[PDB]
Design a binder for this molecule. Structure first.
Ligand SMILES: [Cl-]
Lengths: 101, 232
């Protein structure tokens, strides 16, 4: 079939972000500015994006890692905001006791 | 399909397409499945461990029966759920999930974000398990001086205060006991502004009592003691 493919909306609704805030691993053209979720097509996993200088683009995404340009910089991708691993990581920080009311 | 249910469910739980099974699919193996979607209630569940080779017998009200053997099992919440977090923290050993500072050196590099903030100090000095405790933050730390055991100041000028209503003891200031030279931690106790309790034997070189707060209490005439080092 053709353009029945609602991938972007499915990824975006799942992470509770706007359609515009999604980028897929193979899109080497769009700017990362304002993106919040990157979807790794090859492993069908969404991830949260760390802070990236404005004006950057994907060079490649692979195994939990994002390579961007300009600068051939690599950064680890994040678990999604609303995940188990994010909550466990947050509580597990040195100052973690502060989250217990 | 011109139906995208599998995709909607797979992306909702952040798993692959092939890791989803719908309640009506009694043909696919359950091998590698992580999410089961119950068509009747329109609810996703995590799958418990299930022997290789199994297929669905049925799915109803939070339970799944599988073949061979028509075995009933409870469906789990999803990984990424409120319930799963609550259940994980509520386990016997759940205190292990709350992080702590591993030393006063790290506490000095940890800025509090709220006044009165509670933090857990694992130990004074890395790898010793001695001198740990709970501290409370003052964002405005002017007026307070780092003393290396009950007032620890951060690089950006907050103060962590040890929660300790009464006496201090050398371990709070870095004492190690055994054959260590504990002079400086003992000297900090007697200079701290509170009475000192000796809970063990501590080597020292020379100690000075200077204030009306420099009391020392032990629990016996032998085991709680200061011992002068041989070369002092
Ligand atoms: Cl706690």
């Amino acid at each position: 079939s053709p353009a029945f493919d609602r991938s972007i909306q499915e990824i975006a609704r799942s992470a509770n972000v706007k359609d515009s805030e999604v980028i897929v691993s193979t899109d080497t053209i769009s700017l990362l500015d304002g993106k919040k979720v990157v979807y790794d097509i090859a492993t069908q996993t969404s991830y949260g994006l760390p802070t990236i200088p404005d004006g950057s683009v994907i060079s490649s995404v692979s195994a939990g890692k994002l390579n961007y340009n300009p600068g051939d910089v690599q950064v680890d991708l994040l678990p999604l905001e609303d995940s188990f691993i994010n909550v466990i990581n947050t509580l597990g920080r040195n100052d973690g006791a502060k989250y217990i009311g | 399909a011109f139906d995208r249910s599998i995709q909607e469910i797979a992306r909702s739980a952040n798993v692959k397409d092939s890791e989803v099974i719908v309640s009506t699919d009694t043909i696919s193996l359950l091998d590698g499945k992580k999410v089961v979607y119950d068509i009747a209630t329109q609810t996703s569940y995590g799958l418990p461990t299930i022997p290789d080779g199994s297929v669905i017998s049925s799915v109803s009200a939070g339970k799944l029966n599988y073949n061979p053997g028509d075995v009933q099992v409870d469906l789990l919440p999803l990984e990424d759920s409120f319930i799963n977090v609550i259940n994980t923290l509520g386990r016997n050993d759940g205190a292990k999930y709350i992080g702590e500072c591993h030393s006063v050196a790290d506490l000095r590099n940890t800025e509090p974000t709220m006044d009165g903030q509670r933090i857990i100090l694992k130990q004074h000095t890395a790898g010793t398990l001695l001198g740990g405790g709970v501290f409370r933050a003052l964002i405005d730390g002017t007026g307070k001086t780092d003393n290396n055991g009950t007032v620890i100041k951060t690089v950006g000028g907050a103060a962590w205060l040890r929660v300790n209503a009464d006496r201090v003891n050398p371990f709070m200031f870095g004492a190690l006991g055994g054959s260590n030279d504990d002079t400086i931690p003992v000297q900090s106790c007697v200079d701290s502004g509170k009475a000192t309790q000796l809970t063990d034997a501590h080597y020292v070189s020379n100690i000075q009592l200077k204030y009306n707060t420099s009391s020392i209490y032990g629990s016996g005439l032998h085991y709680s003691r200061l011992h002068q080092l041989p070369s002092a």
